[PDB]
Structures are given as C-alpha cells and as structure tokens.
C-alpha cells in the first residue's frame, strides 16, 4: 500500500470503503490460540476418601466415595433462557469468559446485510434462502416467522413432520459435574429443578437427569468470505477497540441456531437398589412391565420434577411435577410441529469470524462419585409354647467403620441368654441393618438325669430377613421347631 486508496488527511473517513478495509485487515491480522481461549476447568479435588456407614430409620447404608473426572468437547451450546435477544443467527459474540459461562457479550454495531438458509422438509431449494438488511434479534425472527407462515399453509399441512428427538441422561453427583455434561447454562434450570446433592452424598437418594430435545428447524449462516463483510462502512477500527476487541478478545458469530422444544427431567428416589438405572430407563420409554412389586416399590418412592422450554405457546419455561404416568406424554407433546408451535432456541453453534472455524469448548472437572449399598433392618421373633424349660443363646456382630475405613465387628448378645424360660414366652428382638453373623441356639431341659439338655435349634450366620419367627413347642422327649421367614 501507499498513497492510493488513502485520503490526503492520513485519516480513514467513517462511512467509507477504506474504513471497512481497515477493519478487514484488523481482524485478519489477529493471532490467538483457539483452544486456550475456549478452555475452562472446574473443581479440583484430592483422591482419598473413607468408607462410611450411616444408620437410617429402616436401613444401614454403606457409602463408598471415589474421585471421578468428567471431560467434554463440543461445539453446540444449550439455551436455557427465552427472553434472550443476544442469541440470533448471525449475532457477533465476544470471545471471553462470558462466552464460556454462557452469558455472552453481544457486539451490537451497524451490521451489513446477511443471508440465511433454513432447513425444512417442504421448502424447495430456491425458497430456503433469506436476506435480512439489518440483522438483529427482531429482524431475523421476523423474517423466519414470516417464512414459516408461507410454508405452513403451502406444505406444512402434512402432519407427520416429526421433531428430531435427542436423549441425554446422566447420574447426578455434583453441580460442577452437571455443568460439564449440559453446559454452564444448566445452572439456571438446575436451580429450578431443586437438585438435592447432600442427600445423594449422604446416600439418602439417587438422582438421574434426562435431556429431551426436539428440533423443528434450524437457521444457518453461510461462510463469511471477508471478516469486514459483516459490518457497515460506518463501523470503524477505533469503534471495535473502544469496545475492547483485540487478538486477546477476538470475535465469534452464531452460525446456526436450533429451534424447537426442550425438557429437563429430574428423577430422585429414596431407593438404594442398583436396578434404579433400569427402572428410570424403562420408565422414560413408558414401557412399564407387568410385575406388581419389583419395580413399583422404587418408583412409588420416586418423585419427579421437570422443566419445559418451548412447545405450545411461546411462553418460556414451564416447571411440571408428578410421579410417572405423565412422562410418556411429555415426549409426545412436541412430537408434531405446527405453526401453532412457534419453537424457540434450544441450541446454537458459533464460528470464528476470522476464518469460519467452528468454536469448540473444552470443559472439565473433578467430582466425587457416590456408591451406596443398603441393608434393611429386621426383626427376630421368639415363641416358646413347649412343655419344658428352654434356654436361648442368641449372638451377633454389629458392623461399624473406622476413621480410616477399617471394618469393625462388635460382638453382641441377647441380655436373656442362658436364662430358664418357660411357656408361654414371646419376645421380639429388633436387629439393625449392620447386624452380621447372627447365630441362634436353643436348648431344652428333658428332665432325664443322664442327658439333662437337648439342643432343639442351632443355626449360624442367619440371614437378616425382614421378619424371622422361631417357634418351639412339643414335649421334653419330642420338641418341635419352626423357622418362618417373611421377606418381600
């Protein structure tokens, strides 16, 4: 360069071709590391935890805690807001922590005409294109909403234009963990979902979270040939610097926006079973099998909360609640796309303005995975109705855990051991879930001088069933025993 294409003033006139050229040269001369700019990491924690047991009202839980790491690399960004005027196709966003935190900084400057393509089953190749003179949230939304009307009446009457369903499920352990899985924008929906994390950590409940995305249509932007093509000539280099744009804080443009319906489902249960994964997964498909008790027990102690974005009327977020029957219809609500369904942004993708390279975000965190094993409390019932004097010898161990996680077995005994008991005698011995090595011996006095005692019942390591009833009866010479187990 030199004199030509330059004013004699040495200045670059606002609203001229030279200004747009200076801007174009300014963006192209930017040097930055793509990956470092879009990298964020959450909590970092040590990897040594203790084994612990806690006594619940009706259960003894053994809790194992282990460090796990979550890492995701994706170019798609989930939307959890509805009144967001920043998230329109073609919008220029600033690359900083606000972008990673899913609270973007919008570069609102005089914009040049931009062309948009929209994918729809009925729209012909030629009719899909769309030109907006001054791309803003109102402008692009108008042109899209206008085009939907023409398509709906023309072709959109064929009903089976099914939404694209997408499933994302994950076990909940921490907020940081969920942000990595669902994006940093999840914290808004996570606050309305009421995720109880302490109870998961204490082994009280197990929580699973499900995504549901149904995409009606997506609006796209063609590749930007020159970085300056996006601005009007009124936009000047000193204007971009005034707004803090540089190689350290470069520019990105929303290249695609997904429009449709989105549901966030939360399933927390007090069940400690390890078929919880199978119960929730079977539930989502609505295929409740015919057994009466095996899965219904956990489900009836499972209660559900949901958050709905999109669907019928354009009003933003709907929080719904119930148990299980309604889950099947939530998926069914947005199955069909109508013009009655406006559809709203649920996901968008960004590309760097300088070279149209799609921006990928690297997110990671350490989280404490919680594993739980429960042991139900039980009862030991004794009934003596025999024609003799009987003696009981009932012993067991109580499992406890050390400060360093060692197993501790504390010997226990019925306080009535060895005592002469006579009919009719009954008692109930409450046994907590941490009871191990339960042994029950029963002897009876025969009254015979040469063999005073007769063993009547002797068992070791008796399983801790819900209700066990040992009943003895009969006579000195012919004692009778019954061991009845009630478990369900």
Author numbering: -16 to 471
How is this structure described in the published paper?
Gram-positive bacteria, including the common wound-infecting Staphylococcus aureus, the virulent food-borne pathogen Listeria monocytogenes, and Streptococcus pneumoniae that causes pneumonia, utilize cholesterol-dependent cytolysins (CDCs) to attack and kill mammalian and human cells.
X-ray data were collected to 2.45 and 2.5 Å resolution from crystals of PLYD168A and PLYΔ146/147. Superposition of both structures on PLYWT showed no significant overall differences, although a detailed comparison indicated small changes in domain D2, helix bundle HB2 and in two of the D4 loops. Around the mutated residue in PLYD168A differences were restricted to sidechain orientations, while the deletion of two residues in PLYΔ146/147 caused significant conformational changes in the loop connecting helix α5 to strand β7 of the central β-sheet. (B) In the pore complex, Asp168 near the end of one long trans-membrane β-hairpin (HP1) forms a salt bridge with Lys271 in the other trans-membrane β-hairpin (HP2) of the adjacent monomer. Like PLYWT, PLYD168A bound to cholesterol-containing liposomes and oligomerized into rings. However, unlike PLYWT that lysed the liposomes within a short time, liposomes incubated with PLYD168A remained intact for hours. Frequently, the rings detached from the liposomes, indicating they were prepores that had not yet inserted into the membrane. This is also reflected by the hemolytic activity, which was reduced by 80% compared to PLYWT, highlighting the important role of Asp168 in ionic interactions between β-strands that stabilize the pore complex. The detachment of PLYD168A rings indicates that the mutant does not insert into the membrane as easily as PLYWT to form pores.
